[PDB]
Amino acid sequence: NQPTRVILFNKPYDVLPQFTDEAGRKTLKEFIPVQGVYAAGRLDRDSEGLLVLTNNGALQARLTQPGKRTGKIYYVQVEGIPTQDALEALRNGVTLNDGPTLPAGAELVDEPAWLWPRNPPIRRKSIPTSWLKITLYEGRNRQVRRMTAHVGFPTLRLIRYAMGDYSLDNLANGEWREVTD
């Protein structure tokens, strides 16, 4: 039948997680000259980082089926310096307009050594920023951005480092690699 194709991509900012043309927007066609693969877990246009692309239904389901509790690790740049109480809330649960969140990982971290510049750069001189490592097991709309804002520390930049088995290890922004066996 259809030979399996699995590709990992480090998605740039302002690129859609798709191959289909979308008027006025940049897509994966500019980066990955492969047809027939699509996202196993879409990553927002204004997010960056790990995108898994495949043609295989089993893998798609494994990674995306609602309720599968697929783990995702994000590095998030936020305004201010989150308090211990705020981080505890992120770990335990907050209630968004669509309901409570599941328990999560949330830790204050150093700016990652592997970070690349964003073009354009983030959104101020007199206000510090911080980095969080957030580990989620759900995939609701703009979830990390909504959670951080909820507890008082809006997101400026969002990078998905890992999803399921996969990570960005050794993948520059805009680069892809094939996963084979």
Q: Would residue 44 show up in a list of annotated catalytic residues for this protein?
A: yes
Query: Could you tell me if 124 and 63 are in contact, meaning their C-beta atoms sit under 8 angstroms apart?
Result: no
What would the two tokens of residue 107 be?
Answer: 């830790």
Q: Which residues of 91-114 are buried (b: 16+ CB within 10 A; e: fewer)?
A: beebebeeeebeebbbeeeeeeee
Task: Name where the chain breaks: residue before each gap, C-N > 2.5 Å.
Answer: 123
Length in residues, the chain: 181
- Give every CB contact of residue 162 below 8 A, 6+ residues apart in sequence: 50, 71, 72, 73, 168
Query: Could you tell me if 54 and 4 are in contact, meaning their C-beta atoms sit under 8 angstroms apart?
Result: yes
Pick the catalytic residue: 14, 44, 85, 169? 44
Handedness of CA 8, 63, 93, 46 (dihedral sign): positive
CB-based burial of residue 11 (10 Å sphere; 0-12 exposed, 13-18 middle, 19+ buried)?
buried
Strands 155-163 and 72-79: antiparallel
3-state SS assignment for residue 5: coil
Using alpha carbons, list the distances in angstroms from residue 91 to 32, 55, 173, 180: 36, 34, 29, 35
- Give every CB contact of residue 109 below 8 A, 6+ residues apart in sequence: 75, 131, 132, 133
CA distance 60 to 2: 14
Ordered by where they begin, the domains of the chain are 1-64+170-179 (3.30.70.580), 65-169 (3.30.70.1560)
Q: What Rg value do the Cα atoms of the chain yield, rounded?
A: 17
Using alpha carbons, list the distances in angstroms from residue 12 to 48, 115, 174: 5, 12, 6
CA distance 162 to 181: 20
